[PDB]
Each structure stands twice: as structure tokens, then as C-alpha cells.
């Protein structure tokens, strides 16, 4: 699962079988780290109009 963003510690209570989560846009917003099983939140890197 590839992408670009900022990885932070998640407070989302994933069920034992869930590998990643999605927001209302149906895009990945959280993943389960395949080695530590830590849940990480994914946010986009700061952006905006100039």
C-alpha cells in the first residue's frame, strides 16, 4: 500500500482482522504496520493555495 503523507500513532480501535481503514471518501486513512501491528493514522502533507 503506497502513498505520501504523515504517519502518526492512531487512536482508532481496529478489530483483530482489520488491516487498514478508510474515511468517508473511501480512501485509506490508517494502516496496520505489518511488522509491529501498530495502527498508524495517515494524513496528507501540509498543502494549500498560494
Amino acid at each position: 500500500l503506497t502513498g505520501t503523507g504523515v504517519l502518526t500513532e492512531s487512536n482508532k480501535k481496529f478489530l483483530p482482522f482489520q488491516q487498514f481503514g478508510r474515511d468517508i471518501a473511501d480512501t485509506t486513512d490508517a494502516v496496520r504496520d505489518p511488522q509491529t501491528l501498530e495502527i498508524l493514522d495517515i494524513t496528507p502533507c501540509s498543502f494549500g493555495g498560494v
Binding site: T2, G3, T4, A25, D26, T27, P44, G48, G49
Partner: protein
């Protein structure tokens, strides 16, 4: 069932019967109008391609479609501030009310700013406000809710302390009861009616305002007109975002998955499919926003007209400033819109009188100068048409034109000469 169009009501019409109100009520009605729309902004390239260089380069093959789309949304965003300005920024000065709110019994505490709250909103405005990732951002309004509230309070202060004069030239102070008396004259009711019933009128007014706050509080649908605008735009954005999950014929809706699997000669085909679909989706969104923006603009223009004609003056346009005879209006700030409290004079408790087009006296035909000739069954009087007030018929309230042999339905009576 088959719907009713209303209760049937026959009018007791005859060639010599007139009904005249012996009383009246002060009614306050609420009109809610959208003024502005959320200033959304969509980054065309990011929406379609995200941070993919490969997609971006293919997007360029479509020319300046993204420039047109970014431009169209920018144009709307600018309009939204213009709409707000046209409605609220109609007063050059920020008028303040006096420390002592003595308006002859008229209580405006529910429409004037509440000084105990940081937001400086009126009790009614406070109620109104309480009731209502993908390159997609929202720009803030130029005028904050606080600034809109300040414009509204200035308009209220002007309306209350200087009537409509501040909407024409300088603010000319006038006692509120006297201002209301002028507004009574403006609807064909003599000024003495205001003064003689000043206590009653102030009480009917104060009661009606209290009813407004209760009506809004107990009616969740009251601000549906503003909520509908919010819902339509939120829905439009949600749909636009959801379209990013569509394949449009591609092996995947995810641009990164295509790029990680395929080489450029094949990725281009899958990407092109996503670009076509996403570009089409964005064009659909923008078109709908332009059409919707036009509707909001029209509403804002209507609101601006009402601000000028209902608040900064007294309207003679029927049903333009509430149902009844317009006396005055008070603006209230609302979420992306304006609420007008229309104060109208409504005739009440009418009764039947016998009437005549003229009085015959000394061979002359006498016509009423201002009012109408009515009989209570034994005596003829002349009275103002909008409020029963039976005066003796005299040469000072009638005029003569022609003889008694011309007017159809002319009746014999005495015309008193002082």
C-alpha cells in the same frame, strides 16, 4: 385525499355596504433569505492527479480545462462576498443606540445586540445561529459573523433612532412614537391613532416580537431555506469526492496502484481513463455550482432590495415586506443569509356600515376629502377608510363638485358649516 385550496368565504357585497375595521393588530412575520454560499475551491490538477507527475503531464494534453474550472470557482467565491456586501453594507456609518432605551414603550431588546455575550448578537440572532484532503478547500468570508452583526446593529440603530432618514441622507433623530406615527400616515391611518393607542400598539408590538423568538425556537424547519443551501453544497462536494473512487473503466480507481503495477506505455491508458472520468466529474460539479450560484445571487439581490425598501424605508409594495400594511422592518444576521422581521399593520374587528358616494346638500354634491361616508343606521359620518373614526360631516372634510342629479346612489344629509 383531494387537497383543499382553503376555506370558502363569501363576501357580503352590495352596492351600498362597506366594512370598516374598528380595531387592528401589529403583526410581525419572518422572512428568511439566502445571501451567500460556501466559498469552495477545488484544485483541478490535485483532484484529478493528486501528486502524480505522470498524470499531470497527461492532463496537460487537454489544454486549459483546469484553468477554466479553477477560474469559474474563483469567480463564484468572489461573488459570494459581493452578495454579502450588497445586502448588509448599505450604511456608511455604524450607528449606535442610546444608553437609555426609551422608545415610548417599544421594546427592542430581542433584536438589538446582547452586550452580555462576546458575539454581540441579539437574542434572536443568537437563536438563528444556533439553529443553523483531495485538493478541496473552503475559503473564509471577507466579512466575519461579527462584522455582519455590526452592520445589522447599525441598520437597527438607524431604523430605531432616525427612522428612514439615514437611508437617504444624514441620520435625523426622531422620537420613536413619532416615527411610528409617520409610518401610520404612510399606510393611510391618521397619526392620532398611533398616539391614542400608543400603549396598546407598543404592547402588541412587544408581544409579536416575543412570538418570533418562540416560533423560531419551536420550529426546526423555520430556517430550512438556509439549511437547504448548506445541504446542497455539502452534497455536491460529497459527490465530487466519491467520484474519485470510480474506475471509469480503469483497472483501479487508485492512481498510485496503476503506477506501481504498470509501465508508462500501459499506465497511460489506465490513467487517461481516470483523467477523463475525473475531469468530467469536476466539470459537472463546477457547472452545478455556477447555476446554483446564480440562484443565490438572485436571492441576495432580492435581500438587498428588501434591505433598502423594507428596512431603510417604508414600502407600498404589497406582500413585499410582509403580509399586511408595511410599517417597518428589522434585519437580523443569519448563517449565510439574512432574516427580516416585518412589522405590519393588520386591520381587525371590522363591522358593516351603509355607505354613499356623495352627500346631497343645498343642491350640491359633496364628496369626502380623505375618507368615506358611512351610516350607523340613523346618522351619516365621514371616516378614514382604514380605521373606523366617525366624524361629523362638515364643509372642512368634504368638497363640492357638480349637483345632486349626476351621482348615482347619492344620499340626502346635512353638511355642517363651522
Amino acid at each position: 385525499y383531494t387537497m383543499s385550496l382553503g376555506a370558502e368565504n363569501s363576501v357580503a357585497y352590495s352596492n351600498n355596504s362597506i366594512a370598516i375595521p374598528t380595531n387592528f393588530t401589529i403583526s410581525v412575520t419572518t422572512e428568511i433569505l439566502p445571501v451567500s454560499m460556501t466559498k469552495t475551491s477545488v484544485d483541478c490538477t490535485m483532484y484529478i492527479c493528486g501528486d502524480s507527475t505522470e498524470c499531470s503531464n497527461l492532463l496537460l494534453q487537454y489544454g486549459s480545462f483546469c484553468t477554466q474550472l479553477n477560474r469559474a470557482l474563483t469567480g463564484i467565491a468572489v461573488e459570494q462576498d459581493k452578495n454579502t456586501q450588497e445586502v448588509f453594507a448599505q450604511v456608511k456609518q455604524i450607528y449606535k443606540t442610546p444608553p437609555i432605551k426609551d422608545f415610548g414603550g417599544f421594546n427592542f431588546s430581542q433584536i438589538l445586540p446582547d452586550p452580555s455575550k462576546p458575539s454581540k448578537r441579539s437574542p434572536i440572532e443568537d437563536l438563528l445561529f444556533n439553529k443553523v484532503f483531495n485538493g478541496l478547500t473552503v475559503l473564509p468570508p471577507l466579512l466575519t459573523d461579527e462584522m455582519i452583526a455590526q452592520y445589522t446593529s447599525a441598520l437597527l440603530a438607524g431604523t430605531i433612532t432616525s427612522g428612514w432618514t439615514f437611508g437617504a441622507g444624514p441620520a435625523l433623530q426622531i422620537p420613536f412614537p413619532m416615527q411610528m406615527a409617520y409610518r401610520f400616515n404612510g399606510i393611510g391611518v391618521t397619526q392620532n391613532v398611533l398616539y391614542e393607542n400608543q400603549k396598546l400598539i407598543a404592547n402588541q408590538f412587544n408581544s409579536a416580537i416575543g412570538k418570533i423568538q418562540d416560533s423560531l425556537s419551536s420550529t426546526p424547519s423555520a430556517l430550512g431555506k438556509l439549511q437547504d443551501v448548506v445541504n446542497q453544497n455539502a452534497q455536491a462536494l460529497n459527490t465530487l469526492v466519491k467520484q474519485l473512487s470510480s474506475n471509469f473503466g480503469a483497472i483501479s480507481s487508485v492512481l498510485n496502484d496503476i503506477l506501481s503495477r504498470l509501465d508508462p506505455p500501459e499506465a497511460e491508458v489506465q490513467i487517461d481513463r481516470l483523467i477523463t472520468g475525473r475531469l468530467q466529474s469536476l466539470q459537472t460539479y463546477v457547472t452545478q455550482q455556477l447555476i446554483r450560484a446564480a440562484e443565490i445571487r438572485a436571492s441576495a439581490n432580492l435581500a438587498a432590495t428588501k434591505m433598502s425598501e423594507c428596512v431603510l424605508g417604508q414600502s407600498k409594495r404589497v406582500d413585499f415586506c410582509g403580509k399586511g400594511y408595511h410599517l417597518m422592518s428589522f434585519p437580523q444576521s443569519a448563517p449565510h443569509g439574512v432574516v427580516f422581521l416585518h412589522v405590519t399593520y393588520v386591520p381587525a374587528q371590522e363591522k358593516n356600515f351603509t355607505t354613499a358616494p356623495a352627500i346631497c346638500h343645498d343642491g350640491k354634491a359633496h364628496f369626502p376629502r380623505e375618507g368615506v361616508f358611512v351610516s350607523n343606521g340613523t346618522h351619516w359620518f365621514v371616516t378614514q377608510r382604514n380605521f373606523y373614526e366617525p366624524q361629523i360631516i362638515t364643509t372642512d372634510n368634504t368638497f363640492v363638485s357638480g349637483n345632486c342629479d349626476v351621482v348615482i346612489g347619492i344620499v340626502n344629509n346635512t353638511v355642517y358649516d363651522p
